[PDB]
């Protein structure tokens, strides 16, 4: 009981250090306890921030310095 108490205090600290009280109670209002599997079903659980970040391949191909020297425009062309 003591160890789980310590880690639930840790978890309390986490949620108080990031989630405000209004959002905490809203999230509590939008959660459900289902017995067949025995878990907390969160409405629209897939569209939370962590899954959205996992869905975004942020790393992209940046280009070379837009301020490079390219003096080849000075060369003429025939006709």
């Amino acid at each position: 009981i003591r160890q789980l108490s310590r880690e639930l205090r840790l978890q309390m600290l986490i949620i108080d250090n990031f989630i405000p009280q209004d959002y905490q109670e809203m999230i509590e209002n939008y959660v459900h306890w289902n017995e067949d599997i025995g878990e907390w079903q969160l409405k629209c659980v897939a569209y939370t921030g962590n899954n959205m970040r996992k869905q975004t391949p942020v790393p992209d191909k940046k280009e070379r310095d837009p301020f490079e020297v390219d003096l080849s425009h000075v060369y003429l062309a025939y006709t």
Partner: protein, 561 residues
Amino acid sequence: VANINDMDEYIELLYEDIPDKVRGSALILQLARNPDNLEELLLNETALGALARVLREDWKQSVELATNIIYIFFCFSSFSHFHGLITHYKIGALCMNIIDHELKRHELWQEELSKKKKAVDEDLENQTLRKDYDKTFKKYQGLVVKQEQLLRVALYLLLNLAEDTRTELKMRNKNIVHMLVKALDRDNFELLILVVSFLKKLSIFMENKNDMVEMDIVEKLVKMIPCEHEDLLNITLRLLLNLSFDTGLRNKMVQVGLLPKLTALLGNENYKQIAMCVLYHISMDDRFKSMFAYTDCIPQLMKMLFECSDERIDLELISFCINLAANKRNVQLICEGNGLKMLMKRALKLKDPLLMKMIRNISQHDGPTKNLFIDYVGDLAAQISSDEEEEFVIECLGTLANLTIPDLDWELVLKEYKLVPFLKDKLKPGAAEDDLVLEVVIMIGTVSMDDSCAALLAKSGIIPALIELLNAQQEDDEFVCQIIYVFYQMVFHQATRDVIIKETQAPAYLIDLMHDKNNEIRKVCDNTLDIIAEYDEEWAKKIQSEKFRWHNSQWLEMVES
């Protein structure tokens, strides 16, 4: 010789026998050399036609008669309105065939000589080697000289014919650049002058430059850069300058070792300008700036800067110096003994914006060279106060903004030069141009590093002006980044913190753009908002509720949809 202006009885012998073909050619040559009877020779019929006919199929067994191809049609080719008649007989076409044939024959001769330079194992001064070799060697000279003469004059004709763009296009379509690069291998001053001049004329075009890119041309110009001829060096340098507009050729120049040679040309000659231009083009690439400090003599470049007495420093030298000042390794060489001191003294005496650009580039670096600037803060601040145009003031402001020395006293500097109202006035909506406003912002950020100035910045009203400027410049990433950095500087001073938090809505702007598309803006905003986390408990609540709402914005809008 004895050749009267009449022109018959000499062309009659021009198509009757082979030993006397050359005699008639030389007799006509004597006349063609005088421009007064050139017209009479021109209106002469069945005379130039016979010359072209004899040229067409009797040049492969003459060489001496092949000096009627040119020196006659070269004489006609020195004047433009005759060119058309020269192209009526297609004489420019035969010149290319002759040049290619001679180049191939020279390669065959060189291969034969190299084969005959293989029996050096035992010396016997007989048919084995040495003696006989010497014989053929002499023969080689006795031929090559003559051939070279032909090449020279033939090329000259083509050069004169290249003054027309169409004819130059026809020449390049027949691989003239390949012939010129091959001819670069010879050892003859006048022929090399002609070839390099032809190449410099051709290289202004993109396709000719691309042709001489694949046929490596810099490797054949390095062997001629330190040459003892004066005109050859000049024309080779002009060709190098024309070629230095291409990145690949520029990279090749440093691989073949052209930097030390070009800087030796920079000492004191008639090639300071062109060598400096080529070096300037080389130094626009960042990895080549460092190698100018590596033995490359840049001390001499300071001497040219200090001795050059005029109101303005020449643009080539100052541009090259500005480019060199962007490297810290070069900056250590510039600021050795007394180098920054003299540069600063000169730029203060004569208001040179370009010299001030060089000084700003020097000040951008964060070694002891930055600590060398403590004696010039007041000197720059004197010029900052809107006296010397705007190109000189902007560089002084930029240099002063670069002095991020952690224990510098800005309070006295601001007190005497009364530079704080000027900085405030430059934050007005229509005060000055955007670059000056940005450098004013960087000034404010640098000044905020000192705690003693904090109170001075609180009562001045700079913070609301910066907020208005951030509102007006919300579409510029640089402006918003620098303003937020100013805020980050002026939070931890206990006097501008109160204005930032309690009096202004700057944290509201910081919240609204914390997750910007720009990494720098995000980093500065995040670091600023950790300072405001503890000094205000309501702003911490806002910084939490925001970015939790934003982090999961879709999950909070999914109720609506």
